[model samples]
Target: EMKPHPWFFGKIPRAKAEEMLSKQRHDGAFLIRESESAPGDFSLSVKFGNDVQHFKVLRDGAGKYFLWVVKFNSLNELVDYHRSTSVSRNQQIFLRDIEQV
Candidate 1:
């Protein structure tokens, strides 16, 4: 399993982060958006092939603050088998293709 970064400790508020996580699960991978009155905006809308999913919110250091949707086989192991296998490297890569439309 991936471990949280050390600097994340005490840097981000926990209560708020948990709330965000709950929201993400309810909203699913798509249709999640967050905005501030004076600052910037952060949003991610995922189109899973023919099906579209949207997730919108700011990022958090801990895993709890974000929505993570993993696809697994019958063994319940997180795998990216459906993703492009043409890449040469074996290192784990996450969220490398996100782009703004």
Candidate 2:
């Protein structure tokens, strides 16, 4: 169920990866695994105080990557709002609206 990300390359150990994921879940983090149909995309669910946020990781065919932190009015429309964003492979991008969630 664990696939390697290019950015993690040689620095991330398999055991550590599992531990981080487990810890996230134990801490009530929304942990979602990547879909088989779209291996290049995955998301993490997080809650900041009373607000909910999603952290998405996307990769292109060329292996370029992008990370997005999206805030939704409600969890019911989380996916729709996330897909509507104009995300791109730019290094300067930062999600200011959402904090660690």
Q: How badly does each model clash, as a count of residue pairs?
A: 9, 0
- Candidate 1 local distance difference test against the native: 0.30
- Give the runs in model 1 whose Cα sits over 4 Å from its true position: 1-39, 58-65, 68-101
Q: Over the stretch 34-87, how does candidate 2's per-residue lDDT look in tens digits?
A: 533445455544333343344555544555444545444433244334334433
Give the per-residue lDDT digits (tens) of candidate 1, residues 10-31: 2223334343333442222222
TM-score for each predicted model, relative to the true structure: 0.24, 0.29
TM-score of 2: 0.29
- State in Å the error of residue 14, model 2: 24
lDDT of each: 0.30, 0.38
